[PDB]
Amino acid sequence: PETRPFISLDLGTANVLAYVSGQGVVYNEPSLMAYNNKTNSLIALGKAAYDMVGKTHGDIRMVTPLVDGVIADMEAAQDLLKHIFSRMKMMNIWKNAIVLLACPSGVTELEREALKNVAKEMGAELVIIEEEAKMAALGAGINIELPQGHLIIDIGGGTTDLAIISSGDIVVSRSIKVAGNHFDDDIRKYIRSEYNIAIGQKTAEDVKKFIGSLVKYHNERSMQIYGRDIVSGLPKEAKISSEEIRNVLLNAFSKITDLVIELLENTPPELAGDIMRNGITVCGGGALIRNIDKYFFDIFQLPTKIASDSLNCVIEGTKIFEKTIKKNIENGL
Amino acid sequence: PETRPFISLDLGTANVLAYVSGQGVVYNEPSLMAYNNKTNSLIALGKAAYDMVGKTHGDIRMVTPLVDGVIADMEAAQDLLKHIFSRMKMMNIWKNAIVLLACPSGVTELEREALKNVAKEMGAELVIIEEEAKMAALGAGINIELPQGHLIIDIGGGTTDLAIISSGDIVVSRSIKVAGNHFDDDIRKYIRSEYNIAIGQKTAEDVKKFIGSLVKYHNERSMQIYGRDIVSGLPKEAKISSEEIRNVLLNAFSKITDLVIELLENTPPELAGDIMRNGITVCGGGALIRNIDKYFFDIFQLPTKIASDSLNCVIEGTKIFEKTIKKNIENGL
Amino acid sequence: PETRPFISLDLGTANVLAYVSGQGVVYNEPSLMAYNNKTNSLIALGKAAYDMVGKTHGDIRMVTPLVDGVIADMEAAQDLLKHIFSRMKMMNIWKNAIVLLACPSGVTELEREALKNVAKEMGAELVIIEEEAKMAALGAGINIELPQGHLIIDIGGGTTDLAIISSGDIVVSRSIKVAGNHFDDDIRKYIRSEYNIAIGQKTAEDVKKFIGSLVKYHNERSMQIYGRDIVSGLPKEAKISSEEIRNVLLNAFSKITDLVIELLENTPPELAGDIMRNGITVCGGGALIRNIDKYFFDIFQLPTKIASDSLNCVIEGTKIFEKTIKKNIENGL
Numbered sequence: 001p002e003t004r005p006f007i008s009l010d011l012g013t014a015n016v017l018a019y020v021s022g023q024g025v026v027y028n029e030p031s032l033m034a035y036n037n038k039t040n041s042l043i044a045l046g047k048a049a050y051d052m053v054g055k056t057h058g059d060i061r062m063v064t065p066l067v068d069g070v071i072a073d074m075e076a077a078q079d080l081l082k083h084i085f086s087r088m089k090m091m092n093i094w095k096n097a098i099v100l101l102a103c104p105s106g107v108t109e110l111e112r113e114a115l116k117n118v119a120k121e122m123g124a125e126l127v128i129i130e131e132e133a134k135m136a137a138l139g140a141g142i143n144i145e146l147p148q149g150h151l152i153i154d155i156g157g158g159t160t161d162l163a164i165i166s167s168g169d170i171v172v173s174r175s176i177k178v179a180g181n182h183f184d185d186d187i188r189k190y191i192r193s194e195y196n197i198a199i200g201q202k203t204a205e206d207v208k209k210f211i212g213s214l215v216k217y218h219n220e221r222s223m224q225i226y227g228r229d230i231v232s233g234l235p236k237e238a239k240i241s242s243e244e245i246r247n248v249l250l251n252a253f254s255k256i257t258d259l260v261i262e263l264l265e266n267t268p269p270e271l272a273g274d275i276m277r278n279g280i281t282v283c284g285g286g287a288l289i290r291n292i293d294k295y296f297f298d299i300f301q302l303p304t305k306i307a308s309d310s311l312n313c314v315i316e317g318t319k320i321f322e323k324t325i326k327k328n329i330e331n332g333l
Numbered sequence: 334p335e336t337r338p339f340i341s342l343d344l345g346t347a348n349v350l351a352y353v354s355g356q357g358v359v360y361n362e363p364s365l366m367a368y369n370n371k372t373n374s375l376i377a378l379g380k381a382a383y384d385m386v387g388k389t390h391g392d393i394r395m396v397t398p399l400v401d402g403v404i405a406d407m408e409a410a411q412d413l414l415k416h417i418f419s420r421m422k423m424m425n426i427w428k429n430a431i432v433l434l435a436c437p438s439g440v441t442e443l444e445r446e447a448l449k450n451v452a453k454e455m456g457a458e459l460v461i462i463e464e465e466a467k468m469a470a471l472g473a474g475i476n477i478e479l480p481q482g483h484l485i486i487d488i489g490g491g492t493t494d495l496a497i498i499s500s501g502d503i504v505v506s507r508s509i510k511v512a513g514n515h516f517d518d519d520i521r522k523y524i525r526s527e528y529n530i531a532i533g534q535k536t537a538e539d540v541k542k543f544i545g546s547l548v549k550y551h552n553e554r555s556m557q558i559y560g561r562d563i564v565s566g567l568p569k570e571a572k573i574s575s576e577e578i579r580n581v582l583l584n585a586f587s588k589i590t591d592l593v594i595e596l597l598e599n600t601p602p603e604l605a606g607d608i609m610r611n612g613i614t615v616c617g618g619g620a621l622i623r624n625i626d627k628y629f630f631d632i633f634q635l636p637t638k639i640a641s642d643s644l645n646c647v648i649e650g651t652k653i654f655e656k657t658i659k660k661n662i663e664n665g666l
Numbered sequence: 667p668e669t670r671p672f673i674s675l676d677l678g679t680a681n682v683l684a685y686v687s688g689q690g691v692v693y694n695e696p697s698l699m700a701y702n703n704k705t706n707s708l709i710a711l712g713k714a715a716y717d718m719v720g721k722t723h724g725d726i727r728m729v730t731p732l733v734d735g736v737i738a739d740m741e742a743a744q745d746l747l748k749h750i751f752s753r754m755k756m757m758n759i760w761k762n763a764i765v766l767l768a769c770p771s772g773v774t775e776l777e778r779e780a781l782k783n784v785a786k787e788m789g790a791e792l793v794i795i796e797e798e799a800k801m802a803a804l805g806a807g808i809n810i811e812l813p814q815g816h817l818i819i820d821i822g823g824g825t826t827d828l829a830i831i832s833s834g835d836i837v838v839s840r841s842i843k844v845a846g847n848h849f850d851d852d853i854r855k856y857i858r859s860e861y862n863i864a865i866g867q868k869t870a871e872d873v874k875k876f877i878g879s880l881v882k883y884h885n886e887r888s889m890q891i892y893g894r895d896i897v898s899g900l901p902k903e904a905k906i907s908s909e910e911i912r913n914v915l916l917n918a919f920s921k922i923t924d925l926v927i928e929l930l931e932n933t934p935p936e937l938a939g940d941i942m943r944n945g946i947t948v949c950g951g952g953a954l955i956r957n958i959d960k961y962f963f964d965i966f967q968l969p970t971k972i973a974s975d976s977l978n979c980v981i982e983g984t985k986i987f988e989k990t991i992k993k994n995i996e997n998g999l
């Protein structure tokens with residue numbers, strides 16, 4: 001007999017997802033928010049704010065409420081929470097609700113406590129904080145309860161997260177701030193250096209998605225980009241090829257492969273054998289980079305699987321974990 | 334339930350247009366006014382005053398009430414507003430009316446406030462001031478609400494106005510006092526230098542319209558002009574060709590192309606890509622100069638469209654914006 | 667509802683014309699008056715006095731009441747006004763009448779005021795003074811209201827009047843005292859120098875009318891003149907040819923063409939173009955000089971029309987202007 005609503009949230013640096021027990025996933029939009037600096041009014045958020053990135057008047061302020069699991073703008077976080085459930089024809093579901101949040105391993109206890117405080121402020125009565133790595137593992141269809149080791153690589157917009165999981169525990173974890181946003185910056189840096197053209201972030205992210213890859217793929221294809229020539233200052237277009245972008249990504253993943261090496265270096269020997277057999281599981285947005293699994297196999301010789309629907313791994317995991325959370329509540333935890 | 338009349342106005346330096354909700358465009362005449370200097374009586378305005386330019390006794394004073402969106406003659410502005418609706422068989426529609434005015438980006442807050450004060454003086458209760466660039470964009474059939482960048486070039490009689498528009502906002506704007514009047518002066522300067530003939534403004538404007546162009550066109554044709562020989566002081570005629578006038582306009586547009594370059598130089602890179610794809614939109618009277626679109630394409634390589642009915646873009650935009658203004662009034666703005 | 671009579675007057679230096687509303691032109695005779703110097707009695711006026719010019723006893727005094735629009739003899743003017751309407755079987759129509767007078771541009775405000783005073787003295791209640799040039803333009807069938815420029819050349823007995831007219835206004839005006847009387851004097855001067863014969867004015871005026879011309883015409887014809895030989899003092903006749911007289915007129919019109927040149931030199935350039943297209947209109951008595959239009963065309967290359975019935979242009983114009991004057995009276999002007 002549970003009368004209270006169950007809410008889970010994936011408050012990622014790039015995409016925010018919200019789940020309501022009984023309704024399903026009720027929100028899944030970019031995390032960007034647009035404020036007016038002269039008046040501090042919330043102009044837009046989600047897709048509406050994402051379409052404006054780089055095309056906005058100088059009075060508009062683009063905000064990311066959460067950066068790497070840390071509330072970066074208190075008021076923006078509060079505004080986003082007051083909106084995710086605004087398209088649900090119901091009174092506030094935050095009231096005395098059970099809230100399950102997922103945090104990267106890098107988040108601090110104080111920052112975790114600040115997360116709970118914002119949820120309680122909305123009206124929740126119980127606020128549980130789970131490890132993102134095990135939520136993602138669950139979402140990818142891994143039975144984390146088993147005494148079997150798995151290597152999870154969660155590539156998001158702000159951070160790349162590495163976790164050795166086994167018996168539902170994170171035995172080893174590493175995190176680095178080289179992810180989707182870092183890849184975009186480097187794509188932008190390269191195009192500037194090579195073609196003397198200044199492109200926006202939105203354009204950098206679109207070539208990443210449209211031709212980005214780590215190993216040659218079955219539909220190699222070029223792309224036309226449009227930016228501002230650094231010399232003339234006028235609009236200028238250029239043709240970008242798959243090879244060039246593959247080399248940019250290979251350069252940026254050099255630091256991620258180094259984190260994997262360090263992670264394995266601190267992994268208990270008996271868990272190392274499981275890694276040889278169970279391999280790597282890649283999830284998050286970065287799991288969509290073409291042939292990222294072939295890349296990891298070539299370098300490490302470990303089996304590498306891309307989680308199906310890798311953008312939803314975390315939120316999908318919170319849905320699986322709902323049963324566990326309601327069994328614990330029934331046990332007084 | 335709106336009982337108050339809706340009035341919008343395009344108070345251009347050359348042509349004044351007035352719109353009444355329910356009646357349509359109710360006034361569209363030149364902005365010139367004719368006063369008697371010995372008595373200060375309003376002799377004529379609109380077409381009647383325009384036909385007299387350069388043919389009037391020395392006691393007559395030609396007045397332009399608004400020059401570049403700035404009330405230049407307070408009393409003349411007041412007289413014009415008391416006349417636009419004089420051919421409407423109705424009592425004053427200014428009473429407690431909703432008035433929508435459009436201003437060039439160069440107008441100052443104080444001058445904008447002076448505009449509202451004149452409208453309130455007539456009897457209006459609500460006086461809204463919109464950007465001319467977005468009214469013109471609307472008039473040209475652009476969905477300014479979309480997160481897509483457009484370059485608007487508004488060539489009038491007093492000013493050329495450049496605006497980068499996107500998401501219903503003016504992200505970048507530049508304005509220059511090189512427009513129809515400047516072109517006429519230069520046509521007059523050229524004919525004096527080349528043929529030693531002093532022509533009036535009316536004659537300068539008519540050759541601009543009758544053979545003026547920026548690129549060779551499908552009906553190249555000469556024109557006979559009539560002026561006063563600077564040496565003999567007697568009447569003298571001359572034959573003016575398309576080529577000569579094209580070269581005069583090409584010289585004057587050199588400064589407009591420089592403003593476009595500066596505008597693009599201060600345009601965010603991601604908006605520059607949209608400009609490459611959406612191109613330029615030319616409106617205003619100057620949009621009628623022959624092959625002005627071919628001119629802009631040749632120089633910048635950007636798609637260039639001439640707004641259909643480019644003299645009515647602004648007023649047509651105020652009509653489209655009426656719905657938005659009445660939704661805001663319903664929301665207490 | 668107008669109960670008051672309407673009177674208009676053309677008080678020319680040579681011919682006086684009077685118009686009564688409802689009756690038409692009621693008087694049209696030479697302006698000469700004959701007084702007895704020993705008794706100051708009015709002997710004759712009009713045609714009767716004109717037939718006596720040069721044939722009168724030494725006690726008779728020939729008077730011109732108005733010379734160039736200026737009352738030259740106060741009593742003679744008063745006598746003429748008491749006679750123009752003497753052949754109308756009605757009581758004084760001057761009583762509380764509306765009087766429209768026409769003045770050359772050279773007349774002074776004081777002289778204009780003296781004109782009104784004489785009319786009021788007769789019994790008029792309203793005395794309007796119009797420009798002769800626009801009355802003549804009207805009489806010649808020009809729509810002076812239009813914003814189109816016309817060059818009017820009014821050649822009378824005392825003055826030649828030049829006016830640029832447009833929008834019912836005299837934009838530029840010049841006047842010279844070289845007209846019919848000056849031509850007669852020069853005809854008399856020539857015949858004296860060439861044939862040693864002293865002719866009277868009447869004879870000078872008759873050869874001007876009978877063979878006078880400015881360009882060779884289709885019925886070149888000689889004339890027999892009769893005067894007093896300067897040597898013998900006895901009567902002597904001589905044969906005068908068309909050529910000789912044409913050369914005399916060409917010499918006298920040299921000063922009129924100079925006035926036209928000066929007029930055009932002070933004409934606004936945009937009005938100069940209209941002059942090229944609308945041309946010159948010649949009216950007054952001097953418009954009857956043969957081929958005066960061919961003369962003006964040859965010298966200036968401007969279209970030149972002779973007003974039909976050029977002696978009646980002014981009075982005919984006052985008749986057209988009657989409607990305007992009665993609309994103004996209805997408006998309290």
Ligand SMILES: Nc1ncnc2c1ncn2[C@@H]1O[C@H](COP(=O)(O)OP(=O)(O)NP(=O)(O)O)[C@@H](O)[C@H]1O
Pocket residue numbers: 011012013014015016068069155156157158159160179180181205208209212283284285286288289290310311
């Ligand atoms: N097809 C694709 N190819 C490459 N990158 C992609 C693709 N689709 C999305 N991305 C990137 O994946 C990221 C979004 O993944 P996501 O898992 O939602 O990150 P996040 O959880 O919101 N941020 P984080 O807090 O670091 O986990 C963005 O940087 C996207 O640019």
Ligand SMILES: Nc1ncnc2c1ncn2[C@@H]1O[C@H](COP(=O)(O)OP(=O)(O)NP(=O)(O)O)[C@@H](O)[C@H]1O
Pocket residue numbers: 344345346347348349401402488489490491492493512513514538541542545616617618619621622623643644
């Ligand atoms: N066919 C044409 N070819 C060239 N110029 C033209 C043509 N028709 C009109 N114009 C000019 O266009 C101008 C009028 O355009 P318009 O948009 O009405 O300006 P405006 O709004 O009244 N003045 P502004 O306040 O500067 O915008 C005048 O300078 C005209 O001479």
Ligand SMILES: Nc1ncnc2c1ncn2[C@@H]1O[C@H](COP(=O)(O)OP(=O)(O)NP(=O)(O)O)[C@@H](O)[C@H]1O
Pocket residue numbers: 677678679680681682734735821822823824825826845846847871874875878949950951952954955956976977
């Ligand atoms: N056929 C003709 N050829 C030449 N001159 C003529 C002819 N008929 C009349 N005239 C002259 O024309 C003059 C009369 O014209 P008119 O328009 O009546 O002058 P006016 O108005 O009376 N004088 P003014 O006050 O100067 O305008 C006289 O000088 C006549 O000699």
Ligand SMILES: [K+]
Pocket residue numbers: 010011012013014015016017311
């Ligand atoms: K996410």
Ligand SMILES: [K+]
Pocket residue numbers: 343344345346347348349350644
């Ligand atoms: K206008």
Ligand SMILES: [K+]
Pocket residue numbers: 676677678679680681682683977
């Ligand atoms: K006369």
Ligand SMILES: [Mg+2]
Pocket residue numbers: 012013156157284314
């Ligand atoms: Mg994530």
Ligand SMILES: [Mg+2]
Pocket residue numbers: 345346489490617647
């Ligand atoms: Mg305009």
Ligand SMILES: [Mg+2]
Pocket residue numbers: 678679822823950980
């Ligand atoms: Mg006269």
